[PDB]
A paper describes a structure:
The 3.5 Å resolution recombinant sNS1 stable tetramer cryoEM map shows clear separation between β-strands. The density of both N- (residues 1–13) and C-terminal ends (residues 341–352) is missing from the map. Indeed, the space (25 Å) between two dimers within the stable tetramers is not big enough to accommodate the two iNS1 β-rolls. We observed that the β-roll densities, instead of concentrating at the middle of the dimers as observed in iNS1, have an elongated shape that stretches across the two protomers within a dimer. Fitting of the density map shows that residues 18–27 form a 27 Å long β-strand which pairs with the same β-strand of the other protomer within the dimer to form a long anti-parallel β-sheet (hereafter, referred to as elongated β-sheet). As the resolution of this region is ~4.5 Å, we analyzed their interaction by using a distance cutoff of 8 Å between the Cα backbone. Using this criterion, we observed that this elongated β-sheet from one dimer likely interacts with the same β-sheet from the opposite dimer via electrostatic interactions or hydrogen bonds at both ends of each respective β-sheet (Fig. 2c (i)–(ii)). Hydrophobic analysis shows that these β-sheets have an overall highly hydrophobic surface that also plays an important role in stabilizing their interactions. The iNS1 β-roll domain contains three β-strands (residues 1–7, 12–16, and 18–22), whereas we were unable to observe any density for residues 1–13 in the sNS1 stable tetramer, probably due to disorder in this region, and residues 18–27 form a long, continuous β-strand. Analysis of the epitopes on all NS1 molecules in the unbound stable tetramer shows they are only partially exposed (37.5%), thus discouraging Fab binding. While the Fab is able to cause dissociation between dimers in the loose tetramer and hexamer, it is unable to do the same to the stable tetramer.
NS1 is secreted alongside dengue virus particles during an infection. It is a multifunctional protein which exists in different oligomeric forms intracellularly and extracellularly, and they play distinctly different roles. The intracellular NS1 (iNS1), exists as a membrane associated dimeric form and is a part of the viral replication complex. The extracellular secreted NS1 (sNS1), exists in higher oligomeric forms. sNS1 likely causes vascular leakage symptoms in DHF/DSS via two pathways—indirectly, by stimulating the innate immune response through activation of complement and Toll-like receptors, and directly, by binding to endothelial cells causing endothelial hyperpermeability. sNS1 when bound directly to endothelial cells causes barrier dysfunction of the cell monolayer as demonstrated in an in vitro trans-endothelial electrical resistance (TEER) assay. Here we show by cryoEM that the recombinant sNS1 exists in multiple oligomeric states: the tetrameric (stable and loose conformation) and hexameric structures.
Author numbering:
A (entry chain B), B (entry chain D), C (entry chain C), D (entry chain A): 14 to 116, 127 to 339
């Protein structure tokens, strides 16, 4: 009989850990580092948080398994501090290697993601090189996956992504971002969950209404993977370039923060970098104004106090 | 604790019946027809199949409940024959009415959807007037719903619609259309299920990659609600303007029809209207050629035999 | 990484049509009838509604394709009228056949489902013989499926079934039955959807709390596939043996029917067969009493008016 | 229109963290401990892992906020080491309290879950006292929840549970347990995921086929929350009472561990406590026998090497 048919559900993959990358075995990757090191590369800064974990998970192996190939170097991991900036280089295969598939530290230093930007510039660090392909299938081990990007690219991973819309709401999904929008009378952004900030450009292939979108009228800037959509719009708002992105995990919501309220005026100044966490004396500013805002204003919530959108400045 | 969170599944609403529209009670609707009839309107042709059913489900009521308001007219329903064309008019509130909320046929004739295009032109028939709003909630009775469109519009319903994508496939969903696309190496259309053909324009708010889309490089023409997307692309193809849309229920697939095969050549002519159901003698044409096609070609499947895309013509 | 994992959703398969059974091709089935006819079998009465449709869908073929095997007989289908009773016989393979896989009506009559119980007794009709196995996979055509039951059995089909529970509610699912229960303070039945009534016994392998269940304390009797569960319990209630099961499609709900109310008393009589659709004069009985009931009482809703549970009788 | 309807999906809640219990505010709970302490109670050992985390998450508050009520004591948290045994007492409200809703350590010791069984016996520790009710709704903060159990009970929490079955497989779900069974020809257990081991009895309200189940023919013993079901059966097997439950996180699978194979014989001895992780010399035993087993045998997998079921013993 018939029958159309119809299926598919999405998504069930928020805040998971994750992630490893062996396989792909460090054989090809380590040989790439050796051939990259002689090319003058110095550091690696990850494009995703789990990528930084995968380096940290496998780094002691490359500390010695690379030395098993009579080549000497040292690699040390670091920590995560938002924003997770972008490197200006990448490494490519080069699939030829001379080593054994499963068969330190006096030499020069090859950096790994760490708060040491003053040591080596981002212009001398590879970025967004290794990524799925292949897949995440199928026993939660990925996968064998994490193939090398043949072509230099700025877009994020195209595999672990999602976007959907059903009659009241549209969401954009990846490992970290959970931008969500709703429809009261006009489609507009409602809430979003941020757990990191990646500088990779959001890919058009997983957006909605990607027509006539103004880069200056967004909510989340494109440079921090802001989806090109009308769902990134909101009346009386503009891009949050100077927002508190340096914080690690964030939250998007239209509301009033605790003990504070905002009055719509016109004497209030123009946009400016966010504030309110915290006052030097530990106090707060109960007064708040915004010129072209729209109540409820944008509050910033995370592993900290409160911040407000750049349209919101204190009266005094 | 936290918590993101994450939910939502879609979709579960293919080939359902459906559909009624009372409530909204025929009180306001019937009074609108009475005020529309004195405005020179003659016919109604539905924008969706279920709308035609709703007329057929409620038509005997307006045959007499309208006469209870000392106004006389006659309305007769018809049948469905693809394509379900579009009327060039609409009716609008006008919310003032003088009748009773629940408290023929000698006069002039007000037409209803039926195969009688030679009687009254489509330019004298209302179209795409009544639609949800409000909703479908919540006991499968809609809803109270089916409010009047204040503004004349060409886009289809924005409520009962859906679209999604998850790491391998993207689909566009409504009551009837089930356009689906996949990713082997480049994103392209794979299959689609057609059960009617509505002339309402597909709205951009539920599409994907709606940038740089060429109206001449689609698969499904925009005039028959072809989503503006790269997922409507396919290499070596163009728009199916002259396809066998007159058939009621269709099927999109890249394959070879039974007992036939296609050889890629260059002497084969250019595109032309589809064929192969059936030969005047009941035979078939085993030979097939296409100039700029790409195997497997486009076959048309439905409540009939086989048809091929316009790029596919017989050698002889 | 890890990873548990976790998936599965259920269900999306209510009120679907469905259903065909070719394949399995009528080759083996028809030969079985021919060998069954010489065994003295006379009638066929389906165990599911869709089975009756499958007979009706394929019956003209066996009217003549059986005659192609130089054996003559006649078969006529009928209609569906609740309840869909059970036959006391069945047909079994016997896989040997002498005919062609795809290569009337003067002789005796082999009855099929029809309101002709006075003609041939149910004790001379086969029942619950053909069923899935194999499956419903995978293009909505089943399947090839509908294999013969090697062993005589009374339980319903074990393939197309479902049951689940998640923190507030438990449901039992098949093609037609949608028994549902909830938890306010003690687990109890809340609502159920009936679209047919099959006499096959509900299988224990898809129930819940199948311990210490009293056959006299159910809501839906076992003989009409009442799941053996505590979720079939309700305080102050018993089995609905004499309910209005003769109606085709039903509805289970705890509420008051329109224009009527029930007062809890003790002078009211004991249980008795249901009523209230309709009064001989077309009226209703606004007064209602029940001895050991519990408000809200059980109302019967369907393609008819209202009926009440046997615990509910009029005061006069 | 109609409409049945049909919905519900399950589950999406594996390996989450979780969990906090404020609210309910420690006001009532702390006063309960103070009144419990004068009743001779000594320690607390949690029934779930997240409960132990909840104690660890809130313990410093009760270290001092209890002292704010001019009563002095000390509470020290510990660690988790399987199995998470059961205490023989509980604490009950007693809702009367004299303190302030949000307005150490010289005194006696009130113990908390930790590897100190030699200090205070489990017979002098409360267990399975606090649990949801109320709910987990609705911002991932629960909830306000964690109400006191009015009645002493041995069953686990009834709220955060799940069980389902759909045409090929049945699963039992809670925070940690993911017992799963399938159907090849007879229903039998296939795989299960264990991340803790709780001594609370599995509740019958969320099982399947809870009839005629023999406590000696299960796979997972009832004392460690083994669902009473036929899905806990397996031919040629019995209960895993003496299994390696002392390990924290486990895995159920029918397979052969790496580098080892099992031969079915009869000279092999009877059942015995599991082994094979590891040999005193770090070796393995490639030879394996089992009297009444059935290939593939039961392997134990987790944060360790391999173990085999009690039916499997070495030949030598």
């Amino acid at each position: 009989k018939c029958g159309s048919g119809i299926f598919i559900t999405d998504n069930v993959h928020t805040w998971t850990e994750q992630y490893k990358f062996q396989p792909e075995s460090p054989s090809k990757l380590a040989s790439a580092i050796q051939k990259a090191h002689e090319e003058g590369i110095c550091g690696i800064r990850s494009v995703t948080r789990l990528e930084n974990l995968m380096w940290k998970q496998i780094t002691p192996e490359l500390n010695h398994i690379l030395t098993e190939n009579e080549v000497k170097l040292t690699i040390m991991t670091g920590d995560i501090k938002g924003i997770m900036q972008a490197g200006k280089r990448s490494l490519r295969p080069q699939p030829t290697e001379l080593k054994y598939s499963w068969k330190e530290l006096h030499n020069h230093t090859f950096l790994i993601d760490g708060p040491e930007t003053a040591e080596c510039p981002n212009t001398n660090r590879a970025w967004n090189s290794l990524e799925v392909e292949d897949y995440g299938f199928g026993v939660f081990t990925t996968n064998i996956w994490l193939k090398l990007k043949e072509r230099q690219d700025v877009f994020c991973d195209s595999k672990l992504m999602s976007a959907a819309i059903k009659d009241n709401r549209a969401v954009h999904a990846d490992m970290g971002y959970w931008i969500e929008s709703a429809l009261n009378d006009t489609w507009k952004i409602e809430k979003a969950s941020f757990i990191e900030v990646k500088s990779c450009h959001w890919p058009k292939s997983h957006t909605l209404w990607s027509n006539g979108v103004l880069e200056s009228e967004m909510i989340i800037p494109k440079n921090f993977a802001g989806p090109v959509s009308q769902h990134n719009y909101r009346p009386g708002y503009h891009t949050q370039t100077a927002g508190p992105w340096h914080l690690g995990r964030l939250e998007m919501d239209f509301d009033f923060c605790e003990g504070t309220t905002v009055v719509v005026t016109e004497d209030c100044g123009n946009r400016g970098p966010s504030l309110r966490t915290t006052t030097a004396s530990g106090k707060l500013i109960t007064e708040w104004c915004c010129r072209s805002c729209t109540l409820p204003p944008l509050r910033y919530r995370g592993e900290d106090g409160c911040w407000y959108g750049m349209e919101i400045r204190p009266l005094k």
